[PDB]
Amino acid sequence: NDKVIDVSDFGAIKDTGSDSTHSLYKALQEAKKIGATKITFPKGRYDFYEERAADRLMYISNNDPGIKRITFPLSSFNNLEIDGNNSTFIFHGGLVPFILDESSHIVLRNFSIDFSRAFHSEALIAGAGKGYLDLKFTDQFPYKINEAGILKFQSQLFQASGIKNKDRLKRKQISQDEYKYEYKRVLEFNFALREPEYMAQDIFTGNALRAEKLNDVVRIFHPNLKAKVGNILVFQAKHRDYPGVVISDSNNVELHNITIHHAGGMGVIAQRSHNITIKDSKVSPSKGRIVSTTADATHFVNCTGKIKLIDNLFESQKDDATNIHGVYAAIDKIIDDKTVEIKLQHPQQFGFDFIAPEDELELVHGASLITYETNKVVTSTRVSNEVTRVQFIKPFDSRIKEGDSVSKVRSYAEVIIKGNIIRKNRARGMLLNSRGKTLIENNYFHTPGSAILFEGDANFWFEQGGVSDVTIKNNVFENSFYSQWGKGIIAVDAGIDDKFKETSRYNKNIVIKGNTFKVFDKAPILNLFSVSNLVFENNIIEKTTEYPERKKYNSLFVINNSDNITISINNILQGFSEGKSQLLSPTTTYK
Amino acid sequence: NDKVIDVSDFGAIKDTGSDSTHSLYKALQEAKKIGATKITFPKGRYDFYEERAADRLMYISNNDPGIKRITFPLSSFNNLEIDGNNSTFIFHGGLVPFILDESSHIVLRNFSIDFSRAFHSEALIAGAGKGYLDLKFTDQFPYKINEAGILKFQSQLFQASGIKNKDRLKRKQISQDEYKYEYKRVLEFNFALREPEYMAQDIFTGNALRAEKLNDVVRIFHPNLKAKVGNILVFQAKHRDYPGVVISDSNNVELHNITIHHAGGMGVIAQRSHNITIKDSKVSPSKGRIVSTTADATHFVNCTGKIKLIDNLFESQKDDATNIHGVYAAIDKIIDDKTVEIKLQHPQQFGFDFIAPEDELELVHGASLITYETNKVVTSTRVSNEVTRVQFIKPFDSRIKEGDSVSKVRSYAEVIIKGNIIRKNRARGMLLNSRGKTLIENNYFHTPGSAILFEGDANFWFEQGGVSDVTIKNNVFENSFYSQWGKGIIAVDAGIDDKFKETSRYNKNIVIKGNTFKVFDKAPILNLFSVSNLVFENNIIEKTTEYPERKKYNSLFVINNSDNITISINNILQGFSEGKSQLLSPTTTYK
Ligand SMILES: OC[C@H]1O[C@@H](O)[C@H](O)[C@@H](O)[C@H]1O
Ligand SMILES: OC[C@H]1O[C@@H](O)[C@H](O)[C@@H](O)[C@H]1O
Ligand SMILES: OC[C@H]1O[C@H](O)[C@H](O)[C@@H](O)[C@H]1O
Ligand SMILES: OC[C@H]1O[C@H](O)[C@H](O)[C@@H](O)[C@H]1O
Ligand SMILES: [Cl-]
Ligand SMILES: [Cl-]
Ligand code: NI
Ligand code: NI
């Protein structure tokens, strides 16, 4: 039809293991040429390789920039639905499955994304001693130990060809693939619960560990290795070069019933885009794996309109389930009374262009995150993937210094996050850096880090946060924040120096009602600073014994430098040995 | 003036160490806007950094592709001379100094190029034992040994700031710079002669060596380490990301009195360009260094017109002094009787586009390098940075198989290489893969590898060679080919399988006259196969004792599968103990 295009008409045949990339490409161009509104896959398994994938330079915020090979290069597509009919997609090597670029009204529906060799690696811990672990790898994680004695994971094990010359080039190719499987650090996971081991920490290794094949078993050596035998050691991928679904300068995108088993980086990363829905989808590992995506499950940078995460499962990724936030760029040079040069600060922010004439920017004091003023841009001149020269309509506030920051005033995204399951990932649940109206309703949280974190800073990540209207209602937080890294189940960790906490009110107007908190010890349920107007009422708090109690904590409510904080008497806490009046009484310390 | 632009008028001030990149940029744009023909630097030292350099995707043949930061982004410039007045240019970090792209009539004159921290590293060998070397590094080569026990070179040593937060970002930045200084292998250099140690070999390490700080001295561990104490160990840079001068799709470019002290990769790399002169220039290390560029000094891919290398010094680079050659692309898929898909084979060839309609291509048998036919292109469709679909005007020769190759029929460059000094580099002198008229006159060669190599192959490098008109006259070859890797002083090593050597005549019409060969043993002066019509006459051959004699060789002239080879009786050989009649008598073996 000129309305519905079947990829098989273009040569893509399921269930054979052959490369479907070019057939898919021609089907895409025909859909655009005639204006078809849907591309369908006959249900089956489709494999995509590097050799015939479109190449484009990409800057992708909070991931690694470079030349990308892209299986679905959805540049300037409009009103196009891709229905996989529950096909499974397998990506071989360094591929970005989807990049939506200047596209509009795109629907992705009914398929799964996976890579044939994960970018992270995993092993069974078979033994442990001072300065070493003994590991067992499955076939799924090929590796070599070279003559230098260094463990190096591989894209695949070299199978000889017959033709001697095809072998020399294939070895060189496998050898250059090593970069993609570089590791950075290791983390112990509980075998039975399939989550980071209780009170285990990241152990920084670098990308080279000393190793020996005992002579089936691999011993790795590092002074700081420690782990329980029988658990699973995860090698964290060093790079974020292959995110799953990139949504960039696009609008009205919907993901329905998408399963992202794996990504080199984040599963879904959206930048400078408007209206995004992710519904009935899954971030969850494929067979034999305890880890899903090697970074965040979802992530939104300078997005507008409505961001909806509805009835999804987000489990087992190496970072947060979501983060919705803006970009700060530091004021690097003051040119004249009207003109500055801003510089993107974090490496995975380089190439993020966002300042244009007529834009309004916040001018922000760095150590306090307090806004001096807003000012309109009349000139924006991109000098590099770091520096942009900005001239304002009027001279900027005379208190502004080099080292302060700007962020664009936006129609901040309205956030609706409901019905999701968030568990077994490594870090936090949700970073709520959304200044727009935010609703967190009917989610389940079981996270090692904070289930919900208000962050943002203008000194390292350079991420704009600061909420103005948040409702967290009818959620279950079950034994969340069980790790050693974090400040509470629901916490503020904005980059506000101690000396400015008393005057900065970065997060405002938060309602926390009707939730159930199942907690195993007395770590903070709320750990707040620089908040104005928060009401915590009609919650149920219920003591458990899921994990050993951490003696470091003896306060459910840590409040500093805030105003209008109501920890209502109408909350219910049962199963604690202390009195209700003590348990609801805020402290300034963990105590 | 509107004719001559002084960079200092645009804010570039010598001898201060500040970044001159943006001032230079505005001077470049003004020169293009008004049509000025020259930009001058007041003599001094100018430093260029990453932060404000223009970023562009680049595919650069025989080097590494990616996003490049470019100090002199000479895109679409015409009739422009850059005169440095013997200024010195210092490049900090990952910068490509010059990229000439679609430019015309460009003159670069009177300056030097260097990087503040070399991409390779060097050390004094202070001790040696089984499976280890003991090294001493100077300040110029900063490094860390991390807790894993791995030696990792650094862009710089971290100097604390005062402000604690500027320190955290700077550490992250220094940490991400580590990739640029990765090593691959080590090679021992003779301290006194400043050249690869006699009969030393590359020792493959990989990018991670075990190491210990003895407690000023660094011990590295690897089973295959062996070296003489007092020599200098060079760590070969793993990447070729920052070549010195890129000349791409450009014409009529001249380099006069340019000193390239260092490059991350090749000093000068030219691709698909027409008429290039390099005169009175130097590739030669800066103070404290024994290595110059980390790959070839110069290199020309699919160039046309005249290539002139006149009165230059090319010393101490890690590869060849020059290589002038074409590209083969393998026939990966046969589509129909008229249509194939070609695929670039070597990773550093990806993104090399060269086939367009109306082009004539050679269709070549892979194992023999014999041309089946030429055929004209009517359709070229780039699928990726690897694959292009090519359709011919007529059905191609029915003997063609997948695995054969194509190369474009070109106005092959006329090559004039005269008055150059070639010495102390690691590999060969000149790879003469130039099918156009070639003149090698009045050069001095002192190379560890072959001084002059006819190479090319369609199985690994995929480089088109095959000479048709070569004159090698009045050169001095002094103790060249003193290493264990090579086949002779002047040798053929084309990728022609043994079974086709008898029928393939890939190199034709070579005159070798009036040269002086000073040789220390009886390795081949000529080692030829698949040559037709070569005359070796009026040469002087003179025995020396510069290096120990290699007992493996007892033949100055090894000839196989050739025709019309004249080793004239009018050559002079003095200082040998064998008879003249034996010494000029060809063999089929080293004997
Ligand atoms: O799960 C138990 C294990 O937990 C880790 O955090 C600890 O470092 C190991 O020594 C072992 O105690
Ligand atoms: O230069 C002398 C040295 O040369 C190297 O090629 C050899 O491996 C060392 O053991 C030492 O003999
Ligand atoms: O703390 C913010 C931080 O959170 C996660 O780690 C993300 O992966 C990062 O990109 C960054 O957004
Ligand atoms: O043998 C050919 C080979 O020669 C040198 O090593 C060059 O650095 C390579 O790019 C390649 O051209
Ligand atoms: Cl202030
Ligand atoms: Cl043949
Ligand atoms: Ni937002
Ligand atoms: Ni040529």
Numbering used by the authors:
A (entry chain A), B (entry chain A): 24 to 238, 241 to 616
Quote the paper.
Here we focus on a GH110 enzyme (PdGH110B) from the carrageenolytic marine bacterium Pseudoalteromonas distincta U2A. A campaign to identify enzymes that could hydrolyze terminal α-1,3–linked N-acetyl d-galactosamine and/or d-galactose from the A and B antigens, respectively, and thereby provide a set of biocatalytic tools to perform this antigen switching revealed a set of enzymes with specific B antigen exo-α-1,3-galactosidase activity. Overall, the results are consistent with PdGH110B representing the founding member of a GH110 subfamily that exo-hydrolytically processes terminal α-linked galactose residues in λ-carrageenan while providing general insight into the specificity of the family as a whole. The overall fold of PdGH110B is that of a right-handed parallel β-helix of 11 complete turns.
This initial model was used to solve the structure of PdGH110B in complex with a d-galactose monosaccharide to 2.35 Å resolution. Residues 25–238/241–616 for one molecule and residues 21–182/186–238/241–616 for the second molecule were modeled, with the missing residues residing in loop regions. The crystallographic dimers have a total molecular interface, determined by PISA (Proteins, Interfaces, Structures and Assemblies) analysis, of 2300 Å2, predicting a stable dimeric state. The expected molecular mass of the PdGH110B monomer is 67.9 kDa, resulting in an expected molecular mass of 135 kDa for a dimer. This indicates that PdGH110B adopts a dimeric quaternary structure, which is most likely the biologically relevant assembly. The bound d-galactose monosaccharide was identified by clear electron density found in the central region of the β-helix domain of both active sites of the dimer. The modeled monosaccharide occupied a pocket that sequesters the monosaccharide in a fashion that is typical for glycoside hydrolases that are exo-acting on the nonreducing end of glycans.
